[PDB]
Amino acid sequence: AKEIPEVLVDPRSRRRYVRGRFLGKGGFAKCFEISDADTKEVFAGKIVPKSLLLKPHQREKMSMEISIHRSLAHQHVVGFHGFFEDNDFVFVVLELCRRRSLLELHKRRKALTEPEARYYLRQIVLGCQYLHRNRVIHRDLKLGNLFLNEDLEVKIGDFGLATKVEYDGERKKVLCGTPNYIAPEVLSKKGHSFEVDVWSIGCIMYTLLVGKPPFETSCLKETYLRIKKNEYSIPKHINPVAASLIQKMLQTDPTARPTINELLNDEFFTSGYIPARLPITCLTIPPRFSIAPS
Ligand SMILES: Nc1ncnc2c1ncn2[C@@H]1O[C@H](COP(=O)(O)OP(=O)(O)NP(=O)(O)O)[C@@H](O)[C@H]1O
Numbered sequence: 526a527k528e529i530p531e532v533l534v535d536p537r538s539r540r541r542y543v544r545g546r547f548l549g550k551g552g553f554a555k556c557f558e559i560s561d562a563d564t565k566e567v568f569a570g571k572i573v574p575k576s577l578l579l580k581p582h583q584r585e586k587m588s589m590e591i592s593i594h595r596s597l598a599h600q601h602v603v604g605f606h607g608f609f610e611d612n613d614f615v616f617v618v619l620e621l622c623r624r625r626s627l628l629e630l631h632k633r634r635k636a637l638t639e640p641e642a643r644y645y646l647r648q649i650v651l652g653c654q655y656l657h658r659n660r661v662i663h664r665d666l667k668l669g670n671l672f673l674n675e676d677l678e679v680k681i682g683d684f685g686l687a688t689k690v691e692y693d694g695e696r697k698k699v700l701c702g703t704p705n706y707i708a709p710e711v712l713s714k715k716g717h718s719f720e721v722d723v724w725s726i727g728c729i730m731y732t733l734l735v736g737k738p739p740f741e742t743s744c745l746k747e748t749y750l751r752i753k754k755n756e757y758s759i760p761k762h763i764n765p766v767a768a769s770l771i772q773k774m775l776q777t778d779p780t781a782r783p784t785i786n787e788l789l790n791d792e793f794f795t796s797g798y799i800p801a802r803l804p805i806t807c808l809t810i811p812p813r814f815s816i817a818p819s
């Protein structure tokens with residue numbers, strides 16, 4: 526393995542990025558804080574070694590991911606600030622999300638308060654609404670792909686399984702990769718579109734409110750069996766408005782699911798308290814949303 530430069534240089538822009546603290550790893554990419562040596566502005570740098578891009582198919586996926594991600598601009602989508610390469614690495618410059626993802630929140634907090642779930646799910650639906658309006662299916666919406674900035678605002682990231690719908694009614698027959706919250710129409714290879722993202726948000730809603738994923742077993746294939754059969758149950762302590770929206774979203778028939786555009790008009794959002802912001806304490810301590818201090 527070749528060792529990553531301590532300074533990243535974009536020859537076309539002229540900008541220079543000092544490699545700061547290591548943020549984490551996934552598939553091909555190591556992620557670091559990187560600072561523009563001029564402006565001192567700090568970004569997430571995703572660094573992919575070309576030594577793992579030897580096959581054209583893997584190169585085509587990376588270039589498709591960049592093509593999709595670079596064209597997106599929205600408050601609840603990870604900002605794409607640029608990309609460049611040398612002989613050994615592809616460098617992608619992203620909006621730094623300093624508070625990790627909803628996966629690290631989930632591991633610490635398990636089941637969230639209903640208003641927290643409402644707050645996060647609104648932002649996820651808003652981001653995904655932007656994607657679907659722009660004919661992008663994410664196809665891997667999960668807690669680990671839902672990044673949190675310093676103000677605990679949701680940023681949808683990782684367009685590694687994302688695809689452009691090219692014409693009305695196009696059904697994708699190929700999903701090269703394994704999504705976490707995989708839709709039944711993908712498992713049964715019956716062809717799929719935008720509705721797989723609504724299924725995924727259904728699973729995310731269930732996990733945030735319940736404190737565990739809806740179809741979890743010890744075997745991934747036993748899990749796929751349960752998804753096929755629609756074999757989940759909502760605990761009885763879940764409020765029936767929440768329970769009802771989960772049920773609408775987690776239907777086997779993708780035509781029966783609400784579209785991304787129907788979701789925010791649901792009773793779960795309109796008839797419930799949505800906080801305008803969450804304090805940092807919500808990373809570790811359940812909020813009470815008290816009317817005043819004591
Ligand atoms: N904008 C960002 N801000 C902060 N950390 C980030 C950011 N983008 C990526 N990371 C971190 O780097 C990891 C890998 O990047 P990611 O975009 O998730 O691609 P991946 O390699 O496909 N991983 P995965 O999401 O697990 O499938 C993430 O899980 C985070 O730990």
Ligand SMILES: [Zn+2]
Pocket residue numbers: 582701
């Ligand atoms: Zn493939």
